[PDB]
Amino acid sequence: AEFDRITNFGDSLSDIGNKHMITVDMNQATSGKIGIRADKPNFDGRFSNGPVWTEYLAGFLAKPAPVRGHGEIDSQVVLKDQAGKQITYHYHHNALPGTNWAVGGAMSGLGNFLDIDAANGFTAKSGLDVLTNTGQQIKLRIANKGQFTGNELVSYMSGTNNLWFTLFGDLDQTGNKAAGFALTDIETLIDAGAKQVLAANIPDFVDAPWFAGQQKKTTRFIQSHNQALKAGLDQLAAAHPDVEIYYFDAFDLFNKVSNEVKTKGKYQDKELAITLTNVTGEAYSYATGKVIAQPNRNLFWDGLHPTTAMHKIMAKEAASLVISGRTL
Ligand SMILES: C[As](C)(=O)[O-]
Ligand SMILES: C[As](C)(=O)[O-]
Ligand SMILES: [Ca+2]
Ligand SMILES: [Cl-]
């Protein structure tokens, strides 16, 4: 074995419950005043109806299952009631040892980000920016657990939120700007000792329901991001021959799966016991509360995140690359 354990960094595609559990614990600490993310009918705090690809990945590589990790959280939560009066809670959570540092909402780059809402009629003034961008996760893992020793496979899957908050937030990043942030982060991993890196591009989200009417902007972003990331990783691989870099082309996998459903009616993998027959609709609608009968016939769980079947598909592809030594 070249590695005996896996470390994960990224966003809702990878998170096994950080976003969920930090909003549960902040809601308890504020006595009901924080909205819970990834609530039922999402599965056990994942942004899906089952395990996500980082969980299947560890099974397919026969390594230990991911365990959630994060750093110490310490914030002054300042809320405002109806009448404009401020109320405050000092929120703390100790650092949580683990291996999967991903968090829903995270963008490539450093720093914390804001993507938690007040609840129960309160508005939030400050103190909810407790979640960590992908590069911040890396920084915190090194602070908490030291440098990498070479016995880890490190997965890095980020960039979707750099697009998301460009569309629906306050950002204006180009794809190749966002890619540069990912390349900086991945260079931090190498400078910190990582010797095996599984780096993913952004999936082909052309048909994601939440991106309807954003297609020109999404398409240009994703194509520019993924071309920049690939070229940048080729360059890092040439400069660091002691590092195995695996390029998980999530884009092409989503594209291939979707073109098989569009042209042939189905994408089937009998080794995995999966058949997808829908790549354009939500299995779960956040308007009716509708969850269709057989959600694992769909690529999309909600308007963006994949079903657990599509997560399994992703994991098999990524594992395949590692098993076959298919490096840059
Ligand atoms: C800052 As305090 C209310 O936990 O002493
Ligand atoms: C910023 As998002 C789709 O993780 O809510
Ligand atoms: Ca998201
Ligand atoms: Cl770790």
Side-chain angles (χ1 to χ4, degrees), residues 10-328:
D11 62 24
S12 66
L13 301 175
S14 298
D15 186 7
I16 62 164
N18 279 145
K19 193 171 223 190
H20 175 71
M21 287 306 317
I22 292 165
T23 65
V24 170
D25 194 52
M26 298 180 80
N27 186 55
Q28 190 278 337
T30 62
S31 291
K33 301 170 190 55
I34 299 293
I36 289 165
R37 293 292 187 93
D39 211 339
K40 284 174 216 259
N42 302 286
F43 172 82
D44 199 21
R46 287 64 169 174
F47 291 90
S48 196
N49 64 320
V52 297
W53 76 287
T54 50
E55 300 183 78
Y56 294 117
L57 179 69
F60 292 148
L61 295 177
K63 306 297 173 200
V67 167
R68 289 185 309 108
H70 63 72
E72 186 177 13
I73 300 170
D74 195 279
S75 199
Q76 284 291 329
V77 179
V78 179
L79 309 173
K80 283 207 157 143
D81 67 6
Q82 188 139 282
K85 301 295 295 306
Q86 283 188 3
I87 65 167
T88 197
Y89 305 83
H90 178 10
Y91 179 68
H92 189 272
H93 201 104
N94 296 331
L96 173 61
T99 63
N100 184 345
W101 296 70
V103 65
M107 294 162 42
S108 307
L110 294 176
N112 287 14
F113 69 95
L114 179 61
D115 192 38
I116 296 176
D117 298 308
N120 200 43
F122 293 78
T123 56
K125 182 183 266 263
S126 62
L128 290 188
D129 64 319
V130 293
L131 302 178
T132 54
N133 286 142
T134 311
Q136 191 71 15
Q137 299 158 29
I138 292 168
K139 178 177 182 170
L140 296 170
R141 184 281 183 194
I142 298 165
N144 277 274
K145 298 187 63 160
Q147 295 180 320
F148 295 105
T149 62
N151 60 8
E152 314 91 351
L153 175 67
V154 183
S155 68
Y156 184 101
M157 177 182 279
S158 189
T160 297
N161 293 125
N162 295 250
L163 171 53
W164 183 274
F165 291 117
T166 293
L167 301 173
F168 303 125
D170 302 325
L171 247 59
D172 276 315
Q173 296 184 181
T174 60
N176 57 295
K177 176 96 147 145
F181 286 121
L183 292 164
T184 298
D185 290 342
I186 293 166
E187 196 164 4
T188 306
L189 295 173
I190 292 173
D191 290 346
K195 294 303 177 205
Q196 292 92 26
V197 180
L198 172 62
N201 69 11
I202 298 171
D204 183 4
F205 289 131
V206 66
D207 291 310
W210 291 337
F211 290 160
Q214 312 278 356
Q215 292 89 331
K216 293 164 204 92
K217 183 141 184 198
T218 69
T219 291
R220 169 178 51 240
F221 184 108
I222 295 174
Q223 185 293 139
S224 63
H225 178 275
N226 289 353
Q227 183 179 326
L229 180 66
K230 178 55 161 65
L233 294 171
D234 288 337
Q235 297 163 17
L236 290 161
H240 296 93
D242 60 325
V243 180
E244 300 294 285
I245 305 182
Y246 307 93
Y247 181 67
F248 175 21
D249 191 352
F251 188 94
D252 189 58
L253 179 66
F254 278 57
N255 188 268
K256 175 174 77 195
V257 168
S258 293
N259 288 342
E260 287 292 318
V261 172
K262 292 174 189 182
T263 64
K264 304 270 199 61
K266 75 187 172 181
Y267 174 84
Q268 186 167 72
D269 183 328
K270 295 177 187 180
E271 181 236 88
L272 293 182
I274 292 169
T275 305
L276 300 186
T277 55
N278 180 308
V279 302
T280 61
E282 304 176 335
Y284 166 39
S285 172
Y286 275 95
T288 61
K290 174 169 162 237
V291 174
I292 67 177
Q294 295 282 280
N296 292 322
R297 302 301 80 79
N298 281 31
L299 193 165
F300 290 107
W301 170 237
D302 56 24
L304 181 66
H305 309 293
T307 61
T308 196
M310 184 67 182
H311 283 281
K312 191 173 283 103
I313 293 161
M314 290 168 63
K316 171 175 177 169
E317 174 66 19
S320 83
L321 294 165
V322 176
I323 291 163
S324 62
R326 197 72 179 271
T327 67
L328 303 182

